[PDB]
């Protein structure tokens, strides 16, 4: 097999001339030449089969992406693995080769307002499709937003996605959570399992703020610090928003804090477009019930240049305890369509 950085990267003979390009959850990403389609592609190596949670994440992403088809979601072009379960130790996912991602771009590039607007439009266009399938991405952040050379944007990594379940969203205070800390909505720390669509809108609001200044807006250093950062900018929640938190431990934690005033968005972002800041405010609303929804965000005046509901498609239909052995079997079966 062809080898990359000491590790097998066994994708030939169709895919050759491999170069390291990035990191996925359970393996490296390489670029490669596709000898059939005569183009270079990206390939993610996945080695999940030792760990049950890894196999869960792998299977759920494959299941979702094999159903989804959208311009702003990076699809699965091919899946490579051994012909038998016994011989299958890794799985490789082949996807479009993008030029960069927004994490990399924000490290060194100032975005024009026109770029910010177009990026945000595309994020919300893809998110409209995801949410219309009753799916939550749950880990939106700059490194999951890939860009090609003409700044077309695609959302990556559905390994943390779930079907929305708003009736079962409530939990206790300081409940453990998996998705990336800086993009977590305040309710995650207070009373939410992250099972409603508003979780993703919060993350998009954080991404918009980060595009405006090239700095994460809420860079918390640990679990409860994340809430410190959010409240330091939004200010203390209103009585009405507190009354919506029935859990006593969460409510009383908030009541124990000194009063904090809101920091105006145009003080934080003095060069930003005023319409962008109005939309930012509605995405970074403390109360998730009051937070703007994706279709409302698309219709916001900041996005008027691009908004066109007839060109913002939706999904044709809505979308544990399983030992890794059944899950390896399920991954084998889910990937069978790409074999000869
Ligand atoms: C997308 C999700 C991820 O795994 C995430 O970690 C991503 O940031 C890693 C980047 C992968 C990558 C990098 C380049 O660099 C030029 C180009 C492409 O196309 C990709 C890519 O497609 O990532 C997919 C496989 C995972």
């Amino acid at each position: 097999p062809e080898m990359v950085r000491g590790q097998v990267f066994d994708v030939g003979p169709r895919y050759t001339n491999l170069s390291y390009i990035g990191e996925g959850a359970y393996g490296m990403v390489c670029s490669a030449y596709d000898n059939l389609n005569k183009v270079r592609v990206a390939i993610k190596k996945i080695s999940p089969f030792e760990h049950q949670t890894y196999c869960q994440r792998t299977l759920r992403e494959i299941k979702i992406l094999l159903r989804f088809r959208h311009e702003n979601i990076i699809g699965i072009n091919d899946i490579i693995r051994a012909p038998t379960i016994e011989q299958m130790k890794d799985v490789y996912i082949v996807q479009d080769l993008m030029e960069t991602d927004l994490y990399k771009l924000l490290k060194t590039q100032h975005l024009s307002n026109d770029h910010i607007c177009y990026f945000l439009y595309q994020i919300l266009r893809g998110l409209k499709y995801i949410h219309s399938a009753n799916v939550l991405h749950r880990d939106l952040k700059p490194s999951n937003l890939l860009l090609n050379t003409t700044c077309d944007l695609k959302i990556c990594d559905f390994g943390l996605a779930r079907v929305a379940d708003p009736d079962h969203d409530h939990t206790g205070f300081l409940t453990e959570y998996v998705a990336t800390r800086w993009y977590r909505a305040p309710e995650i720390m207070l009373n939410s399992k992250g099972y409603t669509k508003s979780i993703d809108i919060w993350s998009v609001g954080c991404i918009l703020a980060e595009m405006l200044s090239n700095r994460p807006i809420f860079p918390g250093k640990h679990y409860l610090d994340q809430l410190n950062h959010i409240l330091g900018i939004l200010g203390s929640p209103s009585q009405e928003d507190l009354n919506c938190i029935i859990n006593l431990k969460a409510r009383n934690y908030l009541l124990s804090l000194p009063h904090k005033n809101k920091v105006p968005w145009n003080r934080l972002f003095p060069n930003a477009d005023s319409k962008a800041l109005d939309l930012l405010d509605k995405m970074l609303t403390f109360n998730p019930h009051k937070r703007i929804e994706v279709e409302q965000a698309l219709a916001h005046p900041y996005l008027e240049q691009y908004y066109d509901p007839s060109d913002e498609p939706i999904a044709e239909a809505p979308f544990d305890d399983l030992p890794k052995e059944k899950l390896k079997e399920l991954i084998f079966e889910e990937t069978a369509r790409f074999q000869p």
Side-chain angles (χ1 to χ4, degrees), residues 21 23-24 42 74 95-99 104 143-144 146 156:
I21 83 175
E23 290 289 336
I74 184 164
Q95 302 185 271
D96 294 338
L97 180 62
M98 285 327 250
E99 176 171 286
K104 296 172 168 167
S143 66
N144 278 339
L146 309 177
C156 206

Side-chain angles (χ1 to χ4, degrees), residues 21-25 29 41-44 57 61 74 93 95-101 103-104 141-147 155-157:
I21 83 175
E23 290 289 336
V29 185
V41 298
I43 306 182
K44 182 173 65 165
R57 178 170 174 163
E61 167 168 59
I74 184 164
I93 310 294
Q95 302 185 271
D96 294 338
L97 180 62
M98 285 327 250
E99 176 171 286
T100 189
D101 59 74
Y103 178 80
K104 296 172 168 167
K141 57 183 173 174
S143 66
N144 278 339
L145 305 175
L146 309 177
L147 304 144
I155 297 166
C156 206
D157 187 2

